[PDB]
mmCIF file with all atom_site columns, C-alpha atoms in Angstrom:
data_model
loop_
_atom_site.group_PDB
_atom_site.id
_atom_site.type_symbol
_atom_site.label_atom_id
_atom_site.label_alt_id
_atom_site.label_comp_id
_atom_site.label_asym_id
_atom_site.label_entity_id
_atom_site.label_seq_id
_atom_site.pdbx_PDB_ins_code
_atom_site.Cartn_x
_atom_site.Cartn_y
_atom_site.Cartn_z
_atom_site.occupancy
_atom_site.B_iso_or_equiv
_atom_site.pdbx_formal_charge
_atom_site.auth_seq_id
_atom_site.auth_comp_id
_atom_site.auth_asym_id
_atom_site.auth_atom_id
_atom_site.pdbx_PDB_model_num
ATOM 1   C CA . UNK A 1 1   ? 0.000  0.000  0.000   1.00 0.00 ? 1   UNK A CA 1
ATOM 2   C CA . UNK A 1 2   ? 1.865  2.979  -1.823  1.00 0.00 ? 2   UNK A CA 1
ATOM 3   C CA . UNK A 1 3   ? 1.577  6.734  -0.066  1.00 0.00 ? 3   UNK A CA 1
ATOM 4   C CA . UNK A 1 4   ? 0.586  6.894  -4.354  1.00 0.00 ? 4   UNK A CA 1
ATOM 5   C CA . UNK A 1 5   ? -1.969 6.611  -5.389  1.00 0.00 ? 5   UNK A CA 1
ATOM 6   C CA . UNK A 1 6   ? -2.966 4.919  -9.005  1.00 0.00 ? 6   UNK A CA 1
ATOM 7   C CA . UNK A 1 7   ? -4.771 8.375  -10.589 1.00 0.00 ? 7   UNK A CA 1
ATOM 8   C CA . UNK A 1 8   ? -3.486 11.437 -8.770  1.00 0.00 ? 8   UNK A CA 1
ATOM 9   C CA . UNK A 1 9   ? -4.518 15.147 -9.257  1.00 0.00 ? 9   UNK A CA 1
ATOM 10  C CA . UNK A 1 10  ? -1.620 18.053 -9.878  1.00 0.00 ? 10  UNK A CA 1
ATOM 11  C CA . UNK A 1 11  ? -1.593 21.638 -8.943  1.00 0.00 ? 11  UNK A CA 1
ATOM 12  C CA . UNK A 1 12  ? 1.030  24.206 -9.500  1.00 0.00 ? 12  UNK A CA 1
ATOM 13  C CA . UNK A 1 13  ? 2.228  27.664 -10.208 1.00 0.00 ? 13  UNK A CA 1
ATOM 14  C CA . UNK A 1 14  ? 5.321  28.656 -11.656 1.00 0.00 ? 14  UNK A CA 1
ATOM 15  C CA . UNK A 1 15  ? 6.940  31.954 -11.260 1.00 0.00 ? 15  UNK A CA 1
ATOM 16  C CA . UNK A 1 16  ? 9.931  33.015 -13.296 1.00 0.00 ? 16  UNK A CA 1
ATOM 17  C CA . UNK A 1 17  ? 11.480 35.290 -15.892 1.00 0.00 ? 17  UNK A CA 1
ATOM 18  C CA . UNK A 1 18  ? 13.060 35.010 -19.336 1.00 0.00 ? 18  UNK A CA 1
ATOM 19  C CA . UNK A 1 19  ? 15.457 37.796 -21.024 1.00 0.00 ? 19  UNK A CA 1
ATOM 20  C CA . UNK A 1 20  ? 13.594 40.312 -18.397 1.00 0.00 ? 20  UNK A CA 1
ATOM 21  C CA . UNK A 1 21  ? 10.118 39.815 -19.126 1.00 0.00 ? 21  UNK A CA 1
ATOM 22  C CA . UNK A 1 22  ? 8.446  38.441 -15.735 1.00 0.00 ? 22  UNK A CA 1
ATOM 23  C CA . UNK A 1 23  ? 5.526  36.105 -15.632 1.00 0.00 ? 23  UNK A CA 1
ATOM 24  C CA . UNK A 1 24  ? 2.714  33.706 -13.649 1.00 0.00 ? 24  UNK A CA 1
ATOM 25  C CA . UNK A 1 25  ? 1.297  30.924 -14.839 1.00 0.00 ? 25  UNK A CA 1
ATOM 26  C CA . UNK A 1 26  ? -0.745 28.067 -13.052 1.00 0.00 ? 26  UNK A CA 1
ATOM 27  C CA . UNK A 1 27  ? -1.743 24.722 -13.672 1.00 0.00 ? 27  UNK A CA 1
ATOM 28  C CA . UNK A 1 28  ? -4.256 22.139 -12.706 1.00 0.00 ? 28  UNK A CA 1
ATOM 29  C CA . UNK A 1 29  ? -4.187 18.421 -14.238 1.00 0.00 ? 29  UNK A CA 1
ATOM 30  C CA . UNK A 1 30  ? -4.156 14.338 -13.558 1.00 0.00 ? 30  UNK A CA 1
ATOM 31  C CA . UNK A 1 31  ? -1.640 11.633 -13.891 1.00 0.00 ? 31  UNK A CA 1
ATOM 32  C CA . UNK A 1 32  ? -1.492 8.027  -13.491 1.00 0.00 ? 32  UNK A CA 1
ATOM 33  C CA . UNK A 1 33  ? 2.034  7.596  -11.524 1.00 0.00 ? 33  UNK A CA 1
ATOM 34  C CA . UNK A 1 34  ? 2.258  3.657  -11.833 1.00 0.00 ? 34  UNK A CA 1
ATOM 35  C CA . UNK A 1 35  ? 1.684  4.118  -15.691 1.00 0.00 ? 35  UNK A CA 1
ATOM 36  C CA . UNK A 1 36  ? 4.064  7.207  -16.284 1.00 0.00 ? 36  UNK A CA 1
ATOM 37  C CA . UNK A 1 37  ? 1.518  10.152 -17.713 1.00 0.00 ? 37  UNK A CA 1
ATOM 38  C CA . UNK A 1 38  ? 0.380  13.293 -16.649 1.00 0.00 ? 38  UNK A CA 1
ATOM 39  C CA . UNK A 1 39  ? -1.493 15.843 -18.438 1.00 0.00 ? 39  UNK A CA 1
ATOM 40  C CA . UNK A 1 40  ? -2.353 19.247 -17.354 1.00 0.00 ? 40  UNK A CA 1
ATOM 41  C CA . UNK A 1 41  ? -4.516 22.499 -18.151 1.00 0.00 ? 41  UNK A CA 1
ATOM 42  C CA . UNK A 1 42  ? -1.890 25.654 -17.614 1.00 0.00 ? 42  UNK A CA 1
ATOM 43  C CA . UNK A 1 43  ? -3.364 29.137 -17.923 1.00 0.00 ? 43  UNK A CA 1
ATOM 44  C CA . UNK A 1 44  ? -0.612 32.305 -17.860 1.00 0.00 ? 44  UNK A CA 1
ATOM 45  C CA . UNK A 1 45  ? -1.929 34.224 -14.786 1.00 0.00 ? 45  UNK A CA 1
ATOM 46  C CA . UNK A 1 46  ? 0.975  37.746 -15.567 1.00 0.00 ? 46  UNK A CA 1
ATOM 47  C CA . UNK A 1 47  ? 2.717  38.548 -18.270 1.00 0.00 ? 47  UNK A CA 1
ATOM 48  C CA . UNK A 1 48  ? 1.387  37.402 -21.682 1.00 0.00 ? 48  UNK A CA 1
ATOM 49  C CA . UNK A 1 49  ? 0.937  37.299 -24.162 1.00 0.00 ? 49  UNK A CA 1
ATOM 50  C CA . UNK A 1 50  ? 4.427  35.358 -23.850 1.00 0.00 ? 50  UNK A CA 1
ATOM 51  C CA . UNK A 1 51  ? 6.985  37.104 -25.961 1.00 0.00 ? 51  UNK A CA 1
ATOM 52  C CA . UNK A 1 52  ? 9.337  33.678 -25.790 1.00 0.00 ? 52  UNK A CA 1
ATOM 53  C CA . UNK A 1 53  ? 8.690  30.232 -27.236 1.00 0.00 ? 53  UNK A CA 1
ATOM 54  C CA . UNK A 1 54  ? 6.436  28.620 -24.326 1.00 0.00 ? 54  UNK A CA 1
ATOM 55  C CA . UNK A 1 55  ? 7.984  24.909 -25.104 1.00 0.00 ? 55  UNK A CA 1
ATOM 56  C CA . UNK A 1 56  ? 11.058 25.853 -23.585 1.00 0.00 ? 56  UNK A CA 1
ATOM 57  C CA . UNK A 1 57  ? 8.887  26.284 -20.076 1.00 0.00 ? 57  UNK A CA 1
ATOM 58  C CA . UNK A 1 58  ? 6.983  22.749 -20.677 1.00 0.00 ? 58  UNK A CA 1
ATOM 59  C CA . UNK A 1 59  ? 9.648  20.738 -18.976 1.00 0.00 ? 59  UNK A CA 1
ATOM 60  C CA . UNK A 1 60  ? 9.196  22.411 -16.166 1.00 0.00 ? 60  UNK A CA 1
ATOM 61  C CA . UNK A 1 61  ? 5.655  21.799 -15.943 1.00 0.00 ? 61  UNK A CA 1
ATOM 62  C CA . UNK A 1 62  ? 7.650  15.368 -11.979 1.00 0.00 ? 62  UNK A CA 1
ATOM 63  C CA . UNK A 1 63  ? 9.008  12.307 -12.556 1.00 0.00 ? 63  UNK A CA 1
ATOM 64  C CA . UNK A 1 64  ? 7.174  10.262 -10.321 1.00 0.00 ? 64  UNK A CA 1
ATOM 65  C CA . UNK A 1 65  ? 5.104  10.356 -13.188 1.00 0.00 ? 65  UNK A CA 1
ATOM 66  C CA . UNK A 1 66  ? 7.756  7.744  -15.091 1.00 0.00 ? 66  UNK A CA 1
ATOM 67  C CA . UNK A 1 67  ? 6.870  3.741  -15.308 1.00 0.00 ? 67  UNK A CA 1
ATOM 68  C CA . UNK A 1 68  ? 9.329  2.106  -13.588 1.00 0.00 ? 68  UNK A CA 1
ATOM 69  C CA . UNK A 1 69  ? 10.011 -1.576 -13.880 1.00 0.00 ? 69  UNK A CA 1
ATOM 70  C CA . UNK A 1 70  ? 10.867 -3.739 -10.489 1.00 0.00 ? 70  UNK A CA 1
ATOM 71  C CA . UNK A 1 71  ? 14.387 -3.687 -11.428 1.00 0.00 ? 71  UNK A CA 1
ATOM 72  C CA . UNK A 1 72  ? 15.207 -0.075 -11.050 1.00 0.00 ? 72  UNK A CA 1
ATOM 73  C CA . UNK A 1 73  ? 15.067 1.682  -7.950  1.00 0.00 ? 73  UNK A CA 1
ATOM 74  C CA . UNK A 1 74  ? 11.953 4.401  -8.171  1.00 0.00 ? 74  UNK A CA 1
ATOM 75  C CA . UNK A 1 75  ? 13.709 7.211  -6.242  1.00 0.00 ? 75  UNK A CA 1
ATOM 76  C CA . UNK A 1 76  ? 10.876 9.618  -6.997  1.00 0.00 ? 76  UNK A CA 1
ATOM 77  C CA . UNK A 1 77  ? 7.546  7.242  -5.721  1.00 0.00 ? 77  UNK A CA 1
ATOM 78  C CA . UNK A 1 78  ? 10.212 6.391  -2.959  1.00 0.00 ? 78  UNK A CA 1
ATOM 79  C CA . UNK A 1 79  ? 10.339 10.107 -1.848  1.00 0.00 ? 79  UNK A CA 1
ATOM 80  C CA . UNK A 1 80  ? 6.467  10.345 -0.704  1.00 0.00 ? 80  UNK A CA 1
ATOM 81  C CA . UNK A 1 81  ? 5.374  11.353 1.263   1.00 0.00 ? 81  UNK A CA 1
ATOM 82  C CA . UNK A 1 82  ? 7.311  14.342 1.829   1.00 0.00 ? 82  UNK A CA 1
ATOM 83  C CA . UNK A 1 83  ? 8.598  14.719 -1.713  1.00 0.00 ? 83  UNK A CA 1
ATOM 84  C CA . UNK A 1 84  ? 11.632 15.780 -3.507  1.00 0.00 ? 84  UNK A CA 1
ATOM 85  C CA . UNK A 1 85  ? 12.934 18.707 -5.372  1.00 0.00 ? 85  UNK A CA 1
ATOM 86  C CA . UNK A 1 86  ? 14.782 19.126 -8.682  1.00 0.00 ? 86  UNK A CA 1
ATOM 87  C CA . UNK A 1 87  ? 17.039 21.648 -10.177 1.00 0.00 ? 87  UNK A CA 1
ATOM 88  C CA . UNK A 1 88  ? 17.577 21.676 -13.723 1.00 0.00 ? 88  UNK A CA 1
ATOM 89  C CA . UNK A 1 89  ? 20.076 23.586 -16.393 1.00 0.00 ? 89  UNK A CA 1
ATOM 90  C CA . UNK A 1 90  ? 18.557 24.033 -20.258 1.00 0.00 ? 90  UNK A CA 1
ATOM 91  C CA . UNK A 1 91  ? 22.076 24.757 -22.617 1.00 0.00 ? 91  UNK A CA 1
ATOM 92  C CA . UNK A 1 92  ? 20.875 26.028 -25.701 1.00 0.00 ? 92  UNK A CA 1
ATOM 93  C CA . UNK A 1 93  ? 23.561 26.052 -28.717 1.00 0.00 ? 93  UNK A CA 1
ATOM 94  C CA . UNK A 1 94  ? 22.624 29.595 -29.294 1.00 0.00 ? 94  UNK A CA 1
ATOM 95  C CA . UNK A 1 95  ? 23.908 30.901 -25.830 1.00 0.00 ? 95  UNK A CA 1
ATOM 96  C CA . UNK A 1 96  ? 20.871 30.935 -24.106 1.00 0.00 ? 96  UNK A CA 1
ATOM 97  C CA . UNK A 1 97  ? 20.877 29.470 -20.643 1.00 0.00 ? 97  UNK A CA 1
ATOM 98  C CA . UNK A 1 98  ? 17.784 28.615 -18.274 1.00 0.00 ? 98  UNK A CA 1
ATOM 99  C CA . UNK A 1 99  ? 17.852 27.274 -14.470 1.00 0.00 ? 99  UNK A CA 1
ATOM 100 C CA . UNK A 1 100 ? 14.907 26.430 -13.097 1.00 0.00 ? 100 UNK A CA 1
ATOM 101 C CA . UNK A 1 101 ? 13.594 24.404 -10.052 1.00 0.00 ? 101 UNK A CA 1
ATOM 102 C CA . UNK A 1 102 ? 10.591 22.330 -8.685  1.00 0.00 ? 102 UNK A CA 1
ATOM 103 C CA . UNK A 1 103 ? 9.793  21.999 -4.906  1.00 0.00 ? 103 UNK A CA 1
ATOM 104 C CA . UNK A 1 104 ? 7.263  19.147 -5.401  1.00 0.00 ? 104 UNK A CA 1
ATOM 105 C CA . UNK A 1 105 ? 5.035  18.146 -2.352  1.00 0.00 ? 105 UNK A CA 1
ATOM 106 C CA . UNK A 1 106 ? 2.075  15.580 -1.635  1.00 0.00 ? 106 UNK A CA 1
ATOM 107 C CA . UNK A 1 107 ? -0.759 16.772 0.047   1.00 0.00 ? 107 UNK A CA 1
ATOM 108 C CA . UNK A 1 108 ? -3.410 14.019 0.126   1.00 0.00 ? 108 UNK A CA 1
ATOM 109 C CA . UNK A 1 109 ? -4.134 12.670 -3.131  1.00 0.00 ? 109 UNK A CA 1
ATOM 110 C CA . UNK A 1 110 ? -2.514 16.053 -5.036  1.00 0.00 ? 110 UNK A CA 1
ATOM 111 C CA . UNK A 1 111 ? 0.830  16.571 -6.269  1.00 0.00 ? 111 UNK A CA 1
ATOM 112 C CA . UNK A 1 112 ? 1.821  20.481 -5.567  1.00 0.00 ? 112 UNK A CA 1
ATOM 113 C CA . UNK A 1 113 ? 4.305  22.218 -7.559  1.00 0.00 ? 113 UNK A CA 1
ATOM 114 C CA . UNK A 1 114 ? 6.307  25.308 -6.683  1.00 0.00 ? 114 UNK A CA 1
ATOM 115 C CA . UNK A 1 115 ? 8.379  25.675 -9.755  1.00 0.00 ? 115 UNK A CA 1
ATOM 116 C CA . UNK A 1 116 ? 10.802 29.039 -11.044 1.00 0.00 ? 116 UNK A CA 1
ATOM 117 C CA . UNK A 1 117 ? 12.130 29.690 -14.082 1.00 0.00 ? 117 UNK A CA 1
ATOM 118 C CA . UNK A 1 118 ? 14.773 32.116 -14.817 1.00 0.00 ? 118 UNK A CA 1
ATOM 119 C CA . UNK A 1 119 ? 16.178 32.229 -19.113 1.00 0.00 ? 119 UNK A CA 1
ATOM 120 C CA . UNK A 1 120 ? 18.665 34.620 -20.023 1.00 0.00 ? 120 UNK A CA 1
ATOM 121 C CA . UNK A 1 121 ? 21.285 35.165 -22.878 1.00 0.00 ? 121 UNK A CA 1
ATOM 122 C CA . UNK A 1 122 ? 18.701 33.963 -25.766 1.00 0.00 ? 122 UNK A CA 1
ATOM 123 C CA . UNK A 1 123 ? 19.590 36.088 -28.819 1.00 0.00 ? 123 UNK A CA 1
ATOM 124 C CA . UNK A 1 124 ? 17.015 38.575 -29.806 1.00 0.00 ? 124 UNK A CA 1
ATOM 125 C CA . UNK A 1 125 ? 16.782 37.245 -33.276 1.00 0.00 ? 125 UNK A CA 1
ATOM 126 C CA . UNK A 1 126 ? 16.817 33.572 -32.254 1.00 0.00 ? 126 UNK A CA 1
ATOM 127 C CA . UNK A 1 127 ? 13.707 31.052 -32.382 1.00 0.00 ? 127 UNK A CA 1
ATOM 128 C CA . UNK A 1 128 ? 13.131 31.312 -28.806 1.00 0.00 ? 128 UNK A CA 1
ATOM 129 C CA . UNK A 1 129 ? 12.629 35.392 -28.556 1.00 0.00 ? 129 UNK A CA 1
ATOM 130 C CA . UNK A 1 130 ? 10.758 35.465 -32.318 1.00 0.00 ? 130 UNK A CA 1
ATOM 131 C CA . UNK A 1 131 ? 8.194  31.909 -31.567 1.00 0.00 ? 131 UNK A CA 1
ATOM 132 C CA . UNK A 1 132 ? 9.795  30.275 -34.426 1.00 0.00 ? 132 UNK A CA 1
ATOM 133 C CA . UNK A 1 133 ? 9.728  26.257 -31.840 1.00 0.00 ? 133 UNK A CA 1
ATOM 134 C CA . UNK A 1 134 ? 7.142  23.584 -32.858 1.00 0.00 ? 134 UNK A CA 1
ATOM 135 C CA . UNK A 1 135 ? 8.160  20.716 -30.594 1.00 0.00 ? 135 UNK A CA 1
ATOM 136 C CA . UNK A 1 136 ? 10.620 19.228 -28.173 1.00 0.00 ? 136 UNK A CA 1
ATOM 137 C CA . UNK A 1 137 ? 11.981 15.968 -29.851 1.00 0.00 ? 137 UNK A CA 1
ATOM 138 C CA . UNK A 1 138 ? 11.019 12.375 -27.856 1.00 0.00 ? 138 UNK A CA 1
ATOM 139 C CA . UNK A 1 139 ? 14.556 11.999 -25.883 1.00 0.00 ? 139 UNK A CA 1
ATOM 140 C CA . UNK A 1 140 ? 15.819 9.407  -23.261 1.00 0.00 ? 140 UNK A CA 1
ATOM 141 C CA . UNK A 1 141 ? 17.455 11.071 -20.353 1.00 0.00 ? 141 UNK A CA 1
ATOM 142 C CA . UNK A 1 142 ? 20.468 9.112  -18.707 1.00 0.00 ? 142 UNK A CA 1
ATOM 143 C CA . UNK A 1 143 ? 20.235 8.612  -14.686 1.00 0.00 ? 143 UNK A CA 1
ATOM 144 C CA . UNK A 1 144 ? 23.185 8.619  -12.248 1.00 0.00 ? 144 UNK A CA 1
ATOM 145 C CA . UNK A 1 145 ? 24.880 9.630  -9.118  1.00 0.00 ? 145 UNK A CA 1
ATOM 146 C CA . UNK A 1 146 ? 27.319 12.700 -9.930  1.00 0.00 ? 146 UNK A CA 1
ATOM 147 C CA . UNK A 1 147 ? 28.568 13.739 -6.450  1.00 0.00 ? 147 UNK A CA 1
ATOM 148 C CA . UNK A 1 148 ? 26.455 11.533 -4.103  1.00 0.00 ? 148 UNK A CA 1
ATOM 149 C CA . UNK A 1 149 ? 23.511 13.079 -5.935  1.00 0.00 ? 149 UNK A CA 1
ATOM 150 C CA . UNK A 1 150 ? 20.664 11.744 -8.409  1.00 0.00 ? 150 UNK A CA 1
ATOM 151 C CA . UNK A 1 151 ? 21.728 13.419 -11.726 1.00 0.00 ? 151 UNK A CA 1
ATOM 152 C CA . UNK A 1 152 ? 19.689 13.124 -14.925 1.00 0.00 ? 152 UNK A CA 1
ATOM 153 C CA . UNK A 1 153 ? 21.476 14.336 -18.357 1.00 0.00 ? 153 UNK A CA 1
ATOM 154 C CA . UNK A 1 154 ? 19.243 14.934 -21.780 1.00 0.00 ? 154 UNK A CA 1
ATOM 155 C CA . UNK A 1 155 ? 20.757 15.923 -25.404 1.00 0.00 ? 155 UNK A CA 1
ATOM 156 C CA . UNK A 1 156 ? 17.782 16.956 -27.239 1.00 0.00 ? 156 UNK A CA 1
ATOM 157 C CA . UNK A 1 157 ? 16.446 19.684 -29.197 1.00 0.00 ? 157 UNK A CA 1
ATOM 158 C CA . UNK A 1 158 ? 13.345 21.519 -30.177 1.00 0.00 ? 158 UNK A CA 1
ATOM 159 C CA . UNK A 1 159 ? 12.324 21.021 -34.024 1.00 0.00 ? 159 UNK A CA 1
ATOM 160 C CA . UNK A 1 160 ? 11.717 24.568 -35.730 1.00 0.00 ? 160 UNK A CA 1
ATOM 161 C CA . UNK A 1 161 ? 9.994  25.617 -38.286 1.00 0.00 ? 161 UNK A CA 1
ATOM 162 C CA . UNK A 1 162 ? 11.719 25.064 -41.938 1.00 0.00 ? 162 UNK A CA 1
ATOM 163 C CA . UNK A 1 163 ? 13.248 21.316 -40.667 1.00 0.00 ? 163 UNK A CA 1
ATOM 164 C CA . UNK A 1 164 ? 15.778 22.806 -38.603 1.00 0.00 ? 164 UNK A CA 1
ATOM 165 C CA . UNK A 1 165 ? 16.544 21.699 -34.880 1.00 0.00 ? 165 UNK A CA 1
ATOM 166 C CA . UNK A 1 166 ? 17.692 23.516 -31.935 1.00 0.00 ? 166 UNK A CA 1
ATOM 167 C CA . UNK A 1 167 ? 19.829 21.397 -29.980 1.00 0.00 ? 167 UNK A CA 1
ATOM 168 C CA . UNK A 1 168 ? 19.659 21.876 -25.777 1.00 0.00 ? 168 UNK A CA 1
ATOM 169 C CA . UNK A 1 169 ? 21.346 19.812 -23.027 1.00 0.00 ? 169 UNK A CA 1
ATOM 170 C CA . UNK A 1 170 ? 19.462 19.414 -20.103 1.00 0.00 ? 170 UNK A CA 1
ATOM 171 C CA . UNK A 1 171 ? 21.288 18.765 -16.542 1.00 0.00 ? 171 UNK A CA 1
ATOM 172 C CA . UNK A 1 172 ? 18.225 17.851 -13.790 1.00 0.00 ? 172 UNK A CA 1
ATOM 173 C CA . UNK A 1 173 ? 19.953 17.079 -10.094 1.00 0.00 ? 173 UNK A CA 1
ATOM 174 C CA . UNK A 1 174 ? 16.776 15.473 -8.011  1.00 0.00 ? 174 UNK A CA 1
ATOM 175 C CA . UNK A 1 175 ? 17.094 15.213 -4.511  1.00 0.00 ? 175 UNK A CA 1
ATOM 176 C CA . UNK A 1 176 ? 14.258 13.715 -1.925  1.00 0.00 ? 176 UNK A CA 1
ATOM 177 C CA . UNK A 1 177 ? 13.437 15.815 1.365   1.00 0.00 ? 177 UNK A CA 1
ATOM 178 C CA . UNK A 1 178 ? 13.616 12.707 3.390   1.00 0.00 ? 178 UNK A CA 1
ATOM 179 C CA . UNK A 1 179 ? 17.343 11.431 4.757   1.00 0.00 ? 179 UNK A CA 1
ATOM 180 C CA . UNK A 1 180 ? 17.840 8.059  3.783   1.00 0.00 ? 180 UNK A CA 1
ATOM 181 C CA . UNK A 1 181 ? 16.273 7.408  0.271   1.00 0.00 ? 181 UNK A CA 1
ATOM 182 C CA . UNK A 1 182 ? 18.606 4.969  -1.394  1.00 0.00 ? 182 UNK A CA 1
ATOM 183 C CA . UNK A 1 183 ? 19.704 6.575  -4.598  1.00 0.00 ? 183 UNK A CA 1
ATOM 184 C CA . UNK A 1 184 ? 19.239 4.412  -7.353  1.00 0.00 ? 184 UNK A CA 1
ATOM 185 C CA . UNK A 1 185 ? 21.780 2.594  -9.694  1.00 0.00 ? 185 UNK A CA 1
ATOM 186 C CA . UNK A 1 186 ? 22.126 3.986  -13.345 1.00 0.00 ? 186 UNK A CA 1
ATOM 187 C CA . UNK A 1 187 ? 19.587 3.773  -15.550 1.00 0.00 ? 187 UNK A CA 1
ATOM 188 C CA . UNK A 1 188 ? 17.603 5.894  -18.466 1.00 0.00 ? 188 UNK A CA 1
ATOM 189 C CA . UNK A 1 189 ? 14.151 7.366  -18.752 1.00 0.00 ? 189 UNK A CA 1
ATOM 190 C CA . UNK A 1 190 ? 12.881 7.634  -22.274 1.00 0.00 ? 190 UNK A CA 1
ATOM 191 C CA . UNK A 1 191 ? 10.086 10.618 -22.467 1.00 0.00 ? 191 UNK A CA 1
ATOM 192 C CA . UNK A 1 192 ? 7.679  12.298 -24.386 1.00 0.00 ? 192 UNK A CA 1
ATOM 193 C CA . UNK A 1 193 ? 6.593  15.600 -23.919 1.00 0.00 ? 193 UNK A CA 1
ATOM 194 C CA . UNK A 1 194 ? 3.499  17.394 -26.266 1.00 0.00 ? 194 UNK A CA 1
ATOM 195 C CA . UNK A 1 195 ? 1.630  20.404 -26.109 1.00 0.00 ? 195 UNK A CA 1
ATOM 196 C CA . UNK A 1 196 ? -1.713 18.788 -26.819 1.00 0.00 ? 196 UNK A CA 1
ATOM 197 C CA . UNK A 1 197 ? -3.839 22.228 -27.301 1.00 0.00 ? 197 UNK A CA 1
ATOM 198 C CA . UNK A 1 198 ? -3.294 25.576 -26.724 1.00 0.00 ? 198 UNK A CA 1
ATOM 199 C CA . UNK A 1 199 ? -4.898 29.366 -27.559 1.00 0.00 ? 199 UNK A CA 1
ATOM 200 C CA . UNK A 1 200 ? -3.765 31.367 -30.051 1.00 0.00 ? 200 UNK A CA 1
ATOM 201 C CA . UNK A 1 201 ? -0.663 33.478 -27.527 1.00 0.00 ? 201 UNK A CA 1
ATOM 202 C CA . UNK A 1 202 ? -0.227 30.165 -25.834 1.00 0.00 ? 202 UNK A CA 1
ATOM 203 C CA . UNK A 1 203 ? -2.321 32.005 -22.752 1.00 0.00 ? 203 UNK A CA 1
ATOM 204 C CA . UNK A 1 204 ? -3.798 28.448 -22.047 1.00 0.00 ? 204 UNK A CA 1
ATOM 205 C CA . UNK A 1 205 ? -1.674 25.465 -23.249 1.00 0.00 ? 205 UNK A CA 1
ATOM 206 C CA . UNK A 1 206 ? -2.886 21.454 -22.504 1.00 0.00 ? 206 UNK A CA 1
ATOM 207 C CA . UNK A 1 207 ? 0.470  19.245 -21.756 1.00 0.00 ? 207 UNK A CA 1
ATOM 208 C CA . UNK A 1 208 ? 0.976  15.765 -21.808 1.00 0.00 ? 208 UNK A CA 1
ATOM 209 C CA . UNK A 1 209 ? 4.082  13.606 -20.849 1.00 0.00 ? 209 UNK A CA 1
ATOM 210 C CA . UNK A 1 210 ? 4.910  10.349 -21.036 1.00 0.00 ? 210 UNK A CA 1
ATOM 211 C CA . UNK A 1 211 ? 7.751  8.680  -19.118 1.00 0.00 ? 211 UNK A CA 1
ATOM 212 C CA . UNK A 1 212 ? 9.333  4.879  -18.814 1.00 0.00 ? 212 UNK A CA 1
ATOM 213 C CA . UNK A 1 213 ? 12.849 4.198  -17.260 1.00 0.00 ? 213 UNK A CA 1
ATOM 214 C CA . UNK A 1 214 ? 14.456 1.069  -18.617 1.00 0.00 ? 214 UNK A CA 1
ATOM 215 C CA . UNK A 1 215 ? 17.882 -0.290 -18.130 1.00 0.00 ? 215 UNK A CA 1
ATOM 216 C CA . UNK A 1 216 ? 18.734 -0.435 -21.859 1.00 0.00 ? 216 UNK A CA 1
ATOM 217 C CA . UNK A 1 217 ? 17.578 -3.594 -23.077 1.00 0.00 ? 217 UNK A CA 1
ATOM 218 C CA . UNK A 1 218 ? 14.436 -5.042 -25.182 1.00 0.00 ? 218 UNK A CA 1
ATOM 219 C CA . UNK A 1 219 ? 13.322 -7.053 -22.219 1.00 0.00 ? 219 UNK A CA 1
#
């Protein structure tokens, strides 16, 4: 009998600001831990319309949301009920650089989320600042202990418009409230993140992930 339960209901606001322009958003939505989705409604509260590329905010927007077979230690279900946190560094090929950070609680059967996100150094005439991202690409991000700490690395990029990517490395260091979680061995996490709908400024965006760890192999 998991502190987790099978459907579980998310809440969260994010604070944060990108090249100087501040904003608010919140979000409301549902995942099914044990079968690693989540899916939420997120409505910009200050600051929009947006004048940056909202996918580079949508990882931001828990990876006890993640399938995890019996074989790998599940450091984030592990961490409930008093949670974890997560700090996370987006590298951009174009100089831009974002550091951001989830504070990720359980109160009853809801997931709370205080996340921040600060993005600076993204060129004025680069996709991010002119809207020109369609999609993070599907990506597998490699788990392991860097300095006695959980430490998740992703090379990925965002597809633009006119078949070009935009490559980003991701750095994510997760570590649980609770003294005494037994980090887990190495391992990876394939994901999927969409925007499912959104409004025409990206004032109200749907999001859906999709997360499995795996050890590498078929079986």
């Amino acid at each position: 009998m998991s502190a987790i339960k099978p459907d579980m209901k998310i809440k969260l606001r994010m604070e944060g600001n990108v090249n100087g322009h501040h904003f608010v958003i919140d979000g409301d939505g549902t995942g099914k831990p044990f079968e690693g989705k989540q899916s939420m409604d997120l409505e910009v509260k200050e600051g929009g319309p947006l004048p940056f590329a909202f996918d580079i905010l949508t990882t931001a927007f828990n990876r006890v949301f993640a399938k995890y077979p019996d074989n790998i230690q599940d450091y984030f279900k592990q961490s409930f009920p008093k949670g974890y946190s997560w700090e996370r560094s987006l590298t951009f090929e174009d100089g831009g650089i974002c550091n951001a950070r989830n504070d990720i609680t359980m109160e009853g059967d809801t997931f709370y989320n205080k996340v921040r996100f600060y993005g600076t150094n993204f060129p004025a005439n680069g996709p991010v600042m002119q809207k020109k991202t369609l999609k993070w690409e599907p990506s597998t991000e490699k788990m392991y202990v860097r300095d006695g700490v959980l430490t998740g690395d992703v090379e990925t990029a965002l597809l633009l418009e006119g078949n070009a990517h935009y490559r980003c490395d991701f750095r994510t260091t997760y570590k649980a409230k609770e003294k005494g979680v037994k980090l887990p061995g190495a391992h990876f996490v394939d994901h999927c993140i969409e925007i499912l709908s959104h409004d025409k400024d990206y004032n109200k965006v749907k999001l859906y992930e999709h997360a499995v760890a795996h050890s590498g192999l078929p079986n």
